[PDB]
Structure formats: structure tokens, C-alpha cells
Paper text:
These enzymes completely degraded the complex d-arabinan core structure of lipoarabinomannan and arabinogalactan in a concerted manner. Furthermore, through biochemical characterization using synthetic substrates and X-ray crystallography, we elucidated the mechanisms of substrate recognition and anomer-retaining hydrolysis for the α- and β-d-arabinofuranosidic bonds in both endo- and exo-mode reactions.
The two structures are almost identical (Cα RMSD < 0.19 Å for all chain pairs), and we will mainly describe the complex structure with β-d-Araf. A dimer is present in the asymmetric unit of the ExoMA2 crystal, consistent with the SEC measurement in solution and the PISA server prediction. ExoMA2 has a two-domain structure consisting of N-terminal β-sandwich and C-terminal (α/α)6 barrel domains, the latter being the catalytic domain. The two-domain structure resembles that of GH116 β-glucosidase from Thermoanaerobacterium xylanolyticum (TxGH116, Dali Z score = 42.4 and Cα RMSD = 2.5 Å), whereas the amino acid sequence identity is very low (21%). Compared with TxGH116, ExoMA2 has an additional long loop and a small β-sandwich domain in the N-terminal and C-terminal domains, respectively.
Author numbering:
A (entry chain A): 3 to 855
B (entry chain B): 2 to 856
The structure:
């Protein structure tokens, strides 16, 4: 296998299935399902009762074997009440496993000393670049490949057993058995698929309502649609008895073995010769989760390999209207915007529910379209992980896509009439284990996130329209957390300099990617105002440099004069000139171009110290949370945006390189055992990482900004991307190797970079590594595509554009474009600053090799 | 040189619990970290106490200083969802490694580090004084850091404890800003011969969440920051570390907040933007409500010098909400009969320890003032339990499991019900979930397994027997197996369990035999005798003397047919009944019971014995769910465990008892569980071993056997190993114990926490019987006789207890020595291996007597 084998003992490792906005379930390195979080909230560590795969292998004329299809557990076994009944941890398992993840696809290869067959699991949820719907199906393929390496036929049953997740409620008389409603399960065969269809009797508009399914297209099935529900776990024992007996299953004659509540379960007030309860009446007194099993049965010849293919699908269509987070409280709202919530009502739907209002619909789609969906997914994996990128960089780019497809992000169906009809992308900053982290598609965080802008640009556009149409007032003040997507009044807190101007940079990015001038024009009156706001409101001494108190991503305000704000502003001005001039807004184009030149001069005159850019302040201790002559890792965040936006260097190339080099030299730690931090920990011990700031020349405040001693993968990524554009390949690679080692499975999961929450949005800065490594520059307005790889010689990269995606392959004398999705109609193709092709058009499925001479 | 085997700092499960009987607890991990902060009348495994940690500043003369948290480095998962948070101070430098050496109640944690210019060890304990439940119930612990200077220059060392109070948390909402329903306080205090930090909270004194804490020393060489800065951001910790790492000295903060008014993200929406600053007091009212302080002790160590930096951590949460408030005995499960006193009695029951000690400081002051005697007793205990002849495996099993008795699982109430009169009453959960009690009501079917308190704190067990007989036993002799009436509530409506009810009667005999108090027995005797007669009357439907048909038991199901668990317990109960009846002059009842017992033993042999073991006789093992038939039930001879411990000897032919025990071992013990198939709960798995509850070596497995048959319970493992020691099957006892304790050797589970339905599970207290069976200790307080009969020949040395006193017994063929460490002992006879060693032996604490044995 190409991916690195992660052993079954790496307990943190979780490979997430599910798509954009769908919610998720993960596979651990034991091959177990974990982190069941379908229900519009995170739920790391949620155990789904009785939900597992199992194998019965019956060698012809030989003893049978029956195992759960999981490697052995390891680690702490001191659960407070033991592993519970519903975990079935006492059933026999496979000795070991290795997990090989190339997100969105995983392979988990099992090893066992005695099982008479060998097993692997291939799993994925499709990902189709530029197709957010196809990439947002609430379902996953679970495909178990079984090999008979023995000399006699083996009859193999692979059986998924599953419980629906819906229905939990807080303990109480409205939630007997912790369940607010009662589940159902049945066998179903319709829509070209067969299997188990789960439901619940909650109201159609209850936020907790949802469905699940476990299906196959395999005709060779054996089923127990509904396990027995008794007070004791009879269901499970009967299931195992049924499976290990013969590798076949039957429906249960009786759905409960209780006649009436007795012994410990007796109702104190029951009439002791009440009439017999019907089974339905007895079921009404019992636990409300339901479980079924779908088995697929094949006799494998000596040597034969066969796939046992399932789909697991789910649908929780209803969200409560509002973030219901921990920041934007209904008493932290400012007056001024109409409160639409009573009129619009208490629910907003997930977008995915328009096509797939229940699990069956999603399953049926995934099975019907599997060749194309899988074909796309596989082409994506091959381009992303099978080209010339160093494996570390492919890992950083690819694995972090998981954040975009996690509970951190979601897509709402028409949440507010003010944006018109259609999907609106919105996101937390991250996911706490059990709730959202930091609501409002936070602009100072999300400005670092690049992945969606290149893979699902539609989503990012929908978000920019919320910020400009709803969250930007007449003066140009833009909220950095948005509440108006729900119809709710705005958050009362004011603008952040990085969030407001980062948003403006993202408007440029979005427009550059799609080429849609109408998109830009709609947002332009508000966007221009936000750029004007900065020079007017944030420069108190009229020198062109933003100064004094401005709020930033560090949750504090910087004072004095300093590069984070100023270099972002410089980039925004440059972007603003491009957009203004294109749109014919000649007054702003001129005004901003003058301003930009003046700012760049003033940055070099004031903030540059001959090695890096730093904060000019009278007294670094006069206000808490400053940094002064410290080296701020984000000093050049503006330049990261500029490189990615095709704006090149904002400042003298040698000065930018010096500054980057200072960041690497001073702020990168190979080992953190001696680091003296009172802050949050995302790197420690024998790990390394880029610090947010350090003070190599002294001047450390008593109380520096409150995250200065921390390590943020997002900042690591942005700096590495800048280093790539600057030609500092070795250092970018070292940053990325070091940070991804913290996420190699030993202590943290590859598919979950963390900050304030799991699947943290800043981690999506990582996509810029592909861009920087390849020097990809797509301008949809010019219809030009160019590459300029940092490393010389032969190369092969994934690329995206608005209209199409594929692979680029570069040699001495030729460049090849192969398109896997959509279409490409280039005015011009450039390689290393030279014209490689004019008028170059390709359709999906076509390859063109162009001579460079 | 440490006697306990070294547990590495990488063993994440390991937690050495400080605290005493009924006090609540905090634990030490193998990194030397404090963890599992659970002082407040409920379990709380995994609760992190913000800003609560020890650190060292080591300033070598003429060398670079080192400032470190006095913990080894963490080593497992680091993927906390938000990172390690500010208040964990996980980004401060730590030590390369540590080795934990626990001989409960004492622990030593030895740090190793390549950069620190001194070497550090932590010695910690909460005193344990056998037979003194109060002295063993101090809500405090000693934390004594030994620092050695192995280098070549003097080093000025500061060892600093920083600590937050735990009190005040509230459910999310407007009255719990920052998650805190009250505001804590901390101050420097010097009083009662001690000094340090005194923590309080502005909750009402009767609030269940009210309490205090203290961190004190008697060292005069202190440096202190009594109250860290409270700002919106964690300025306090930054200032703390700047202050420590600068010079190893601390100062009080001139400003208790660095906020002038709420600003920025914390600004109040409606505030006037140019509002003036608030006072410091008004500003603190708007800020987080936990308070932190730091007590440092400073000494300069010459090359080769060592010094103790001694702290005491103490706490007090005096108030419990009246009632179990568990998950079984809800209002819809309450019986009409006994009237509801709850409204008449008032909403709070106090912890017993809160009678003696008003607050944390009081308990700290006691512990410091009395420390030489308390520690002396504790050290003498440790030496007898762990420094004698027992195989270390056995000493481990006996001593580690005491933790359960001193955990949140158990507590002691001040006078919860007028119906028992005034005084402390012991009560217990079966266990402790991570964040709540497991299975309320001093459950009798579970607690009948527990032996530790009956030998170490018998008074506690007597107080509980009174609740059962006076409160939970009706006029027919039906006894509840979960007791709600201690709180003045109606009884639970569920009826008796055969093992619970008869197990409690066996424990009455046990308690009476230990103490020799006929008045204790007489008060309970009418109720107790009715509970024994209840069995033969109500549970034998075919007149054969054997209990038959539907009887509920510890497996939470009912056995049908006729089967040994019930019947061999009954046999044992009858034999104990005869002793008690005979002594009290209830001569007619003694005779009746003796003859009934003779008939029961004969019927057991004639019906339940199959030539190899005892089993369930039933027409169809599948006619009723949850049976076992011809399976081997590990608990078949539980009655015989009681009988052995109660001095009653073999209940059945010796060869048959040994055969059955051998069959339990042979059939139900597993060295490895890779091949095991269980749809049940997991307490043992994979490459572990254990004793299964049942197995079917000759077939006859029901489709749905009892619901725990395929499980492994340490309590059952212990009871069987105890019986095996009595029966002379030492090797097999040791094997069961070796295998079970290996499950709790720190690799996957903690030595100090055997688990079943909950942490610190009461059944694990069967482990005390290993000492009794290994030593063959037989104490009869009514006869004033003490005998030993060790399973292994030759020289031996054991802990022993009696009602009046405790100590060490040293045995050879030439002499037997008693050394009494506490109390007194007045023996009419001392016997060894059935022979009189001496008569008229009178010892006081601190004395020894060595008797030469006859040739
Ligand atoms: Cl899109
Ligand atoms: Mg959790
Ligand atoms: Mg349905
Ligand atoms: Mg079958
Ligand atoms: Mg200025
Ligand atoms: Mg490591
Ligand atoms: Mg075509
Ligand atoms: Mg075309
Ligand atoms: Mg917990
Ligand atoms: Mg006080
Ligand atoms: Mg100082
Ligand atoms: Mg009866
Ligand atoms: Mg009978
Ligand atoms: Mg082994
Ligand atoms: Mg192991
Ligand atoms: Mg000798």
C-alpha cells in the first residue's frame, strides 16, 4: 500500500467517513466504527450500541470461525462499569490491523493467526472536486474484501449489525431509557438496493428526527431485520448464537422475550392479573433503540477473492435555527437588523436533505452512481497522493480535507430569504467533542482556510455573500461572526482587522477563481466600504499605517503599529485595485493604488527592522498582550494571501525572504521539552512546532498576547506556504514534517488537526501547500492557468479551476493536462513564466500534451 | 530501594488514592500528578483541578536555575479537543520520568530527570489506623517531597504547591457564571500550629456543594503567593511562573485583577463605552470565581544533603443531600408500610467526619499535630501487610483493595435516621461510576462478599447490620437487599434475595464473633432469626429441606430448580445461627437449626453433588431464561467461603468441597481470553486471564444463561481463592490472584481500583479473606481465643486484627510471636495449628510476647 501503515494500537486514529455537511462516522485503526456524529453536532467517543461487522467463515469439511471484524483493543481497559453489554467487547476479534489512509479513501488490512480467510476493509464517502453535492452524500461505502488462501472452499458471511442513532434525550419522563422516541427497523428492497431501513417516530420537524440505512446491491443476503429487545441483552446472545451456528440469520419469531415486566423490572403498581400484554404493548415498555443485521454470503473457492459491499447511510435533515453556541448569546445581539426568526420558524434544513430527505435516498444514489462517484474519488486520490509532492506535503494537503467534511462545517437550505434560495455554507471554527466551537463562520479564522476555495468554491462564495450582504453595515464595519444567516440580529461585537480585510482578500480569491463579475458586483458596494473603513477608522495618525487598538485572531487587540494588520491591508489594497479596475470603479482603483504604494513604503520605513517586521510601540508592557520586537509568525499573513491571489511579493523580495527566514530560525522549535508556556498545548514534549511568537532579541512582555507560546497548525501551514512561494522549500518541508509528525497516529489523529476544537478550520490553510509547491495560478477572468513549481524537473500535481479539475504533468519539453471533471477553456497556459499553450480546451476524460518549444 | 514494584509514569490508568474512609479522595498518577478530584460526596474520575500542581525551583549556586513542574512528562494521547487548556499548565516543563511504588495506604513516587540539579521523590499518604475508623477517616493527605542534592555545589530549592479550591461548580446557566454558582476565597493563615492557604466559598454553609480546602505546612521557611491574579485571560498563571522562575521566591499580588472594567470581547453590550473604571472589588464580581494560591517551602541543600518539603492537603464537604439519589430506588419503587420521615428530618445529612472537623483547616491541624502517632501506626500497618511472608501477589490483593473501602463507594453518615438512634452509620454504593454512585443501598447480595471492613473497621459493619435488621426486615423475616430506610424514606418495594438475606445473617455472625458484644447481637436477634426461618418456610416448596424454585440473587436474575448457591449459603447460615442461638440460650432454635442443617447437608450431597461438583438440578435448563444446570458455577461454594471465614470449618465432606473447588479452577479459570466468546460486560479480555462466573465443560449450556456467566468478577475470583487457601489449594489460589491482579498491574487498569459495576467495587473487598485464609486466623471474641493455621508450612509473618487490638504474628515451629501495634489483646488461649501455644496472654500496644511451642 502507498499510505503509511498505522497500527491498530494507535488509539487516537480515526478515519472520518461522510461528506460536506453530512455529519460523520469514523473508522479507527482497529477497523471499528467510532465517533458516531450524524445529528448536526459533534460526538467524538459516542458508542453506537450493537453496531459492528462480523465474519463467519465455514471451511468445507473444517471447523467454523466467527469473529467481530475488528482488531483487538489495547490501551486502557478500566471503563468504570467494564465495557458495556452493547459494546460486545468480549466477542472474539482479529489479532491486528493496519490502517492505510489516503483521505477520502481508507484501507484497513486485518491480520489474524487462525482465521481461515484474510480480510480487508476499503471505505470511503465519494469526493468529487467542484461538485459540493456529490461530495456531500450522507453515506459511505464499506467494502470488505475476503480472500480464501486455503485449499478447500470456505463459505463466508460478512454481516453488518447496526443500531439507529436517533432519539436521545436528557434523562426523564419524556425520555424513558434515554430515548425521546421509538426506533423502527425493517428489511427493504426498492430503488435498486436492499437491506435495513431505520426510522423513528419523532415528528418530521423535530431536530432529532432522522433515518439510517445499511444496504447492498448484493443479491446473496441473509438477514435478521430486528434483534430481540428484552430487559437483558437477549438480542445480542441470540444474534451470535444464530451467526456462529451456521453463518446464516433469521428474523426473530418474537421481537421481545418478555411477557410482562417482572422481577427487578416489575411495575410496583401493576395489577398482578392484568390481561396479557400484546407484544406491541410489552415493546412499548422496553428500550427504544432497534438493531438489525444484514449479511452477505458467498462460498469462496481456493484462492478466490470477493468483495462484500455495504453502504451505510443516514439523514438528520432538521437543525434548530441559530448557532446555539457559546459566544453569540441573544443578549450579545445588537439592534438594527430585522429579527426574522419568529416568522421563519424554529428549524432550518440541511441542504443535503433536498436531494436526500432520508437515508434510503442517499444510499440509493450512492449505489446507483457508484461507478462515476468512485471513479472521480479514485482519480482524486491518484492525483493528490500519486504525483511528485513529497509524501509529507501530500499528507498535509489531503488529510486536512477531512476538516472541511467534518461537523465543523455545514450547508443550510435557504436559511434566510435575504440571500435568496439555495445552499449557504456556514461553519464553526472547530468541533468540541460534543458541541460546536466558536460560531459564526468566524472571519479571522476562516480567512486562513484555503481548501474550500479551491475544491468547493461555491460554498465559499455563498459565505462571502452572507458577510457582504448581511454582516456589513453602511459604514463598512463588518462583523467577524455572522448571525444574520439565521434571520437573527447581528452580534454586537465590532470588526477585527484581520477578519474584515481577510474577507476582502477572500472576495478577491473567490472572484479570481470563478470569474463571475455579477457575483463580485453584487457584493462590491459593501466590500469597497470595508476596505475604505480601514484607512478611515484604523489610522489615527494619518500616516497610512493602521495603528492603535485593533482586534485580531489572537482574541486581543494589538496597539502601536504592527505588521499583521498592515501587511494584510497592503494585500487587500492590491486585491482591491485589481477588482476596482476590472469593474470600472476607476476612482477607487486610483485611490487604492496610491494608498497601496504609500503603505508599502511606510511598512518598509517603520515596521521593517533590517531582518523582519515587528511592532513599533513606546512600551511593550504599557498594554497587556503585545509583542514589540518579538518575531510574530503571522507578520506576513498578508503575503500568504497575496501569493495565493496571484499578487506576488508585496514588499522587497529580499525583505520578505529575510522575514520568513527570521520566523523559521527564531520561532521553529525542534523539541519542546524546555518550553515555558502557561498557554494551551497543541505540541509538547519531544515534538516540535512553529511558535506563534518568540523574542530572540529580548523585549518579551510580562504578559504577551495570550497564544504567543502556542503552536497552531494553521499558522504553521500559512508560513510553510509562504516559504514555498519564496523558494524556501527545505524549510517549508521541515515545518510540515514536524507538524504532521504530531498527527502521525502516535498521539493524535492524521485526519484531525486541532486548535480550539477538533477539525479546526485554520488547518485548511494546508491547501496552499499544493498551490505553492506547484505555483498554480488560475485567473478565471483572464482564463489563464499557470504553473511554476518550486522544485525543478519533472512534476505531477492535482489542479483545480472553476470549470474543471485534473492533473498536470510537467517534463523538460512538454506539459500534460488531464481533466477528470468538468471542462477547461484556457485563453492561455503558462509554465515557469513562459507561454505553453494558447486557446487550450479539454473536456472531462481528455488528456493533452503540449510542446513547450 | 523500594519494596513495591516500580510502576512507570507511562501507565496512564494508575491512580494512587489519597483520602480516608468516607472523606472523598484525590489521587496521584504515576507521573506524580494530582488527579480524580472527588471531595464533594460524589465520584469524579477525570476531574481536573485548575492550576493545581507542585513545582520546583532549583537554583544551584553559580549555575543556571531550573524551574519545573514536579511531574513526569505525559506520554499517551495528546488530542484533547481544545488542546490541553490554560488551567492544566501542560506547556510548563516537566521531568523525564517517574516510578510509582504503592503500598496502600502509602506511596512513593521517585522522579528521574537529566536536567534538574536535584533529585526528587514524593511520599504521600492519608493515615490508616486499623480498628480506628475516625483516625482512618481524616479528609487530608500528607504530600512530602524529599529533595536530594547529588551535585557538587549548594542548590537553593523551592518546592511550591499551587492549589485551587474545588467547591462551587453549577450546571450551565445564569446563576453559574464561569460554571461557578459561588465565589471562592483564599487566604494566608497561621493558626493551630500550622501555616498555609485557607480556602472557602460564599455558598451557604448548608449547601450540599459547600466546603473548604487547605494547603498547609509546619515548615517555617515559606514563600507565598496567597492569591493569583484573576483576569479574563490567564494572567495569574503567567505572573506566577514569572515570579517563581525569576528567583524561586513568591510575593502576594498587589492587584488581584488586572482588569479595570470589562473591555473588548468581554465588554457589556449595553455598557457606556467611556464608563469609568470599576473598583477592584466590583471588577472581581464580574470575573471567574475559582481562586488559586501558592505555598512554597525554601531550603538550601549542601552537596549530598537531603531535605523534606512537607505539605498537607485537606478538605471538607460536610453536607449530603438526604437520600441515595441513585438510579434504582425511585419514588415509583417505594413500598407502602414504613412511614416517610423525610420531611420531618430535614434536607441535609452530614458526613460523620464533619462532626469532628468543622472545616479543612481543622482536619489539617489535627493531622499535623498528631502526625508522629498517625504516621507511626500507618507505617506499622504497611510493614505488617507488605513486609511479612505472604507472596507479594497476595499482599497486593489484600492491601491494594483497601482503597475501595476508603473510596467514594463508601461513606459514613451522622445520625441519618432517629430510628437507629444517634451515631455514625456506614453506608455504601456497590461502586462508583466516574461521576456518580453505582447501585445504591448497601446492597446485601454484593456487600456480603466484602470482608475488609469486618476485619479492619468492624464498627462500620455493625452500624450497617443494625440498619438492615432494624429498618429493612419486616415482621415475617423478609429483608430488603437495598436499604433506603437509612435516610428515613420508605423501603424499596423489591423483595428479598436469597444470597443477600442469608449473606447478611452470616455477616451478623461474623460481626458478633469479631466483637463479642452480646448486646449488639440481642438487639438484632428477633429480626435476624426471622430472616433465617424465612428461608426454610418461604423458599422450600417441596418440603425436602433444599431451597428450590424462583430466588433472586446477585446475578440480578432468579434461579429456578434447586441449586448450590442458595443451598450452601443456607447451610452456612444455619450453622452460624446455631452458634448465635446456642450462645444466647435460644436452645430450642439452636437444636432445630442444627438438625435442619444436618438434613440440608445430606440433601445437598444427595441431590446437588454430581460426583465432582455441585450444580443446578432442573427439568429443562432452557424452560426459564438465565439458568445454568450442569454448568460449573464459580459461586457454588460461596456459603463455604463464609463458613471458613466464620470459623465454621467445612460444611460438606472435605473431599467433595475440594473436588468442587478443583472443578471451578479446572473448568472456569482461563489463562487467556483470545478464544473466549461473550456477549456480556468486559472486565477481562484479550491476552488476560480470569475466573469465569460459569462454564459448561460437560455441555448443557442454556441458549440464554444467566446474564453474567461469561464475565469475570474480581470479587468471585477472590472468594474462590480464599476458599482454595482454606482447602489447602495454595497454588491454585495464588494462580487466580496472580492472574486477576495482572489485570490491575497498571498496564491497562489501576492496582488501586478493581472494577465491576463501578470503580472501587465493593465485591473486591472479598480480598481481605486472603489474609485470613493464608494465616488461618480465627478470632473468637466471645471465647477470647485467637488461633492461626497457615496454609503454607514453615516460617510466616502476618498482619492480624481482633476487636481489641491489632499487630503482627510471626510463626515458626519453634516459636510464635505476637507484636501488638495498637489497642490491647487479652487471650484465654492462643493456638497454632490446633495446639495451645499459651494461655492468659495480655498485651498492650507496643508490646511483644514470644511463646515456645511444645516439642
Ligand atoms: Cl462548489
Ligand atoms: Mg466525551
Ligand atoms: Mg423511513
Ligand atoms: Mg443462523
Ligand atoms: Mg497610522
Ligand atoms: Mg511520541
Ligand atoms: Mg468533448
Ligand atoms: Mg471542450
Ligand atoms: Mg468522565
Ligand atoms: Mg473558612
Ligand atoms: Mg519571585
Ligand atoms: Mg415460596
Ligand atoms: Mg426444596
Ligand atoms: Mg498469556
Ligand atoms: Mg497487556
Ligand atoms: Mg523452624
Amino acid at each position: 500500500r502507498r499510505a503509511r501503515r498505522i497500527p491498530h494500537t494507535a488509539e487516537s486514529v480515526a478515519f472520518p467517513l461522510g461528506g460536506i455537511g453530512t455529519g460523520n462516522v469514523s473508522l479507527g485503526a482497529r477497523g471499528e466504527l467510532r465517533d458516531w456524529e450524524f445529528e448536526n453536532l459533534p460526538d467524538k467517543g459516542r458508542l453506537n450500541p450493537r453496531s459492528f461487522f462480523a465474519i463467519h467463515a465455514a471451511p468445507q469439511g473444517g471447523p467454523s470461525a466467527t469473529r467481530v471484524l475488528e482488531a483487538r483493543s489495547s490501551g486502557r481497559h478500566d471503563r468504570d462499569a467494564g465495557y458495556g453489554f452493547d459494546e460486545l467487547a468480549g466477542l472474539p476479534r482479529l489479532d491486528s490491523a493496519g490502517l492505510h489512509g489516503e483521505y477520502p479513501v481508507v484501507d484497513i488490512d486485518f491480520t489474524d493467526a487462525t482465521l481461515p480467510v484474510t480480510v480487508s476493509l476499503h471505505a470511503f464517502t465519494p469526493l468529487v472536486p467542484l461538485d459540493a453535492d456529490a461530495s456531500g452524500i450522507p453515506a459511505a461505502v464499506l467494502r470488505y474484501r475476503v480472500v480464501n488462501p486455503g485449499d478447500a472452499p470456505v463459505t463466508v458471511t460478512v454481516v453488518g449489525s447496526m443500531s439507529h442513532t436517533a432519539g436521545r434525550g436528557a434523562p426523564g419522563p419524556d425520555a424513558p431509557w434515554g430515548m425521546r422516541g421509538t426506533q423502527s427497523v425493517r428489511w427493504r428492497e426498492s430503488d435498486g438496493i436492499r437491506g435495513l431501513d431505520f426510522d423513528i417516530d419523532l415528528d418530521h420537524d423535530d431536530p432529532g428526527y432522522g433515518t439510517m440505512s445499511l444496504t447492498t446491491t448484493d443479491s446473496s443476503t441473509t438477514v435478521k431485520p430486528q434483534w430481540v429487545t428484552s430487559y437483558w441483552p437477549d438480542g445480542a446472545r441470540l444474534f451470535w448464537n444464530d451467526l456462529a451456528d451456521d453463518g446464516l440469520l433469521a428474523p426473530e419469531a418474537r421481537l421481545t422475550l418478555e411477557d410482562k415486566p417482572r422481577g427487578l423490572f416489575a411495575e410496583r403498581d401493576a395489577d398482578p392479573d392484568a390481561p396479557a400484554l400484546t407484544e406491541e404493548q410489552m415493546l412499548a415498555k422496553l428500550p427504544r433503540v432497534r438493531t438489525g443485521s444484514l449479511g452477505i454470503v458467498h462460498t469462496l473457492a481456493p484462492g478466490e477473492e470477493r468483495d462484500f459491499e455495504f453502504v451505510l447511510a443516514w439523514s438528520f435533515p432538521n437543525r434548530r435555527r441559530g448557532w446555539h453556541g457559546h459566544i453569540i448569546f441573544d443578549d450579545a445581539l445588537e439592534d438594527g437588523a430585522p429579527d426574522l426568526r419568529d416568522e421563519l420558524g424554529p428549524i432550518v434544513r440541511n441542504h443535503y436533505a433536498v436531494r436526500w430527505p432520508d437515508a434510503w435516498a442517499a444510499a440509493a444514489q450512492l449505489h446507483r452512481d457508484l461507478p462515476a462517484l468512485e471513479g472521480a474519488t479514485d482519480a482524486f486520490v491518484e492525483e493528490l497522493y500519486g504525483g511528485s509532492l513529497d509524501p509529507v506535503l501530500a499528507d498535509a494537503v489531503g488529510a486536512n480535507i477531512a476538516a472541511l467534511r467534518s461537523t465543523t462545517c455545514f450547508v443550510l437550505e435557504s436559511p434566510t430569504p435575504e440571500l435568496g434560495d439555495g445552499p449557504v455554507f456556514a461553519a464553526w471554527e472547530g468541533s468540541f467533542d460534543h458541541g460546536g466551537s466558536c460560531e459564526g463562520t468566524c472571519t479571522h479564522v476562516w480567512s486562513y482556510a484555503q481548501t474550500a476555495a479551491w475544491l468547493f468554491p461555491g460554498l465559499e462564495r455563498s459565505a462571502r455573500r452572507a458577510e457582504y450582504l448581511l454582516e456589513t453595515d453602511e459604514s463598512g464595519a463588518q462583523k467577524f461572526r455572522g448571525n444574520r444567516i439565521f434571520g437573527a440580529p447581528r452580534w454586537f461585537i465590532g470588526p477585527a482587522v484581520d477578519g474584515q480585510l481577510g474577507t476582502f482578500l477572500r472576495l478577491h480569491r473567490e472572484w479570481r477563481f470563478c470569474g463571475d463579475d455579477e457575483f463580485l458586483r453584487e457584493l462590491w458596494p459593501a466590500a469597497a466600504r470595508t476596505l475604505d473603513y480601514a484607512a478611515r477608522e484604523w489610522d489615527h495618525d494619518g500616516d497610512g499605517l493602521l495603528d492603535g487598538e485593533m482586534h485580531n485572531t489572537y482574541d486581543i487587540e494589538f496597539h502601536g503599529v504592527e505588521p499583521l494588520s498592515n501587511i494584510i491591508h497592503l494585500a487587500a489594497l492590491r486585491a482591491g485595485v485589481r477588482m476596482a479596475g476590472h469593474l470600472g470603479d476607476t476612482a477607487r482603483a486610483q485611490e487604492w493604488a496610491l494608498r497601496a504604494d504609500h503603505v508599502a513604503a511606510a511598512i518598509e520605513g517603520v515596521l521593517w527592522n533590517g531582518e523582519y517586521y515587528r511592532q513599533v510601540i513606546d512600551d511593550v508592557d504599557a498594554h497587556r498582550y503585545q509583542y514589540g520586537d518579538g518575531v510574530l509568525s503571522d507578520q506576513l499573513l498578508g503575503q500568504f494571501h497575496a501569493f495565493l491571489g496571484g499578487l506576488g511579493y508585496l514588499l522587497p523580495e529580499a525583505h520578505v525572504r529575510s522575514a520568513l527566514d527570521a520566523i523559521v530560525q527564531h520561532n521553529h522549535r525542534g523539541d519542546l521539552r524546555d518550553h515555558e508556556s502557561t498557554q494551551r498545548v497543541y505540541a509538547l514534549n519531544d515534538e516540535g512546532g512553529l511558535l506563534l511568537a518568540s523574542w530572540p532579541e529580548g523585549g518579551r512582555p510580562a504578559l504577551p498576547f495570550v497564544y504567543a507560546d502556542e503552536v497552531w497548525t494553521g499558522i504553521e501551514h500559512q508560513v510553510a506556504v509562504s516559504l514555498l512561494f519564496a523558494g524556501r522549500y527545505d524549510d517549508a518541508l521541515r515545518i510540515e514534517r514536524t507538524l504532521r509528525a504530531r498527527y502521525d497516529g502516535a498521539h493524535r489523529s492524521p485526519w484531525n488537526e486541532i486548535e480550539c476544537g477538533n477539525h479546526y478550520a485554520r488547518s485548511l490553510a494546508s491547501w496552499g501547500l499544493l498551490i505553492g509547491a506547484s505555483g498554480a495560478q488560475w485567473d478565471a477572468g483572464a482564463r489563464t492557468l499557470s504553473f511554476d513549481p518550486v522544485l525543478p524537473g519533472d512534476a505531477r500535481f492535482l489542479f483545480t479551476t472553476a470549470t474543471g479539475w485534473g492533473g498536470v504533468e510537467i517534463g523538460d519539453d512538454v506539459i500534460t493536462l488531464r481533466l477528470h471533471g468538468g471542462a477547461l477553456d484556457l485563453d492561455e497556459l503558462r509554465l515557469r513564466g513562459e507561454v505553453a499553450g494558447r486557446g487550450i480546451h479539454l473536456d472531462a476524460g481528455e488528456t493533452r500534451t503540449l510542446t513547450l518549444t
